């Protein structure tokens, strides 16, 4: 596993990526983690250029998201403000 830190500025249409996963979401294996499914062309994430599809977000700013429902990790990403530190594993 690789561990990466990615800081993003929030754009007009948000961070520019989608997340699947969470403790309440279907998945194969023991793997219930939040992960990237899509990065939008010309979105903040694609412009930063570091984030990739399938990335596992372990942490959003100072809020842990490794053992939360899909809704807790969505809210954490929505409430995180204008500058967002994503701690990921790929």
């Amino acid at each position: 596993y690789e561990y990466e830190e990615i800081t993003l500025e929030r754009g007009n249409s948000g961070l520019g990526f989608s997340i699947a996963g969470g403790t309440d979401n279907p998945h194969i294996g023991d793997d219930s983690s939040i992960f990237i499914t899509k990065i939008i062309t010309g979105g903040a994430a694609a412009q930063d250029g570091r984030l990739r599809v399938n990335d596992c977000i372990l942490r959003v700013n100072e809020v842990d998201v490794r053992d939360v429902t899909h809704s807790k990790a969505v809210e954490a990403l929505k409430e995180a403000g204008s500058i967002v530190r994503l701690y990921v594993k790929r």
């Binding site: 948000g14 961070l15 990526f17 989608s18 997340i19 699947a20 996963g21 969470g22 979401n25 279907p26 998945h27 499914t37 899509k38 939008i40 899909h70 969505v74 990403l77 929505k78």
Partner: peptide
């Protein structure tokens, strides 16, 4: 991955 929310 039944639920996918765009952020």
């Amino acid at each position: 991955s039944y639920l996918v929310t765009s952020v």
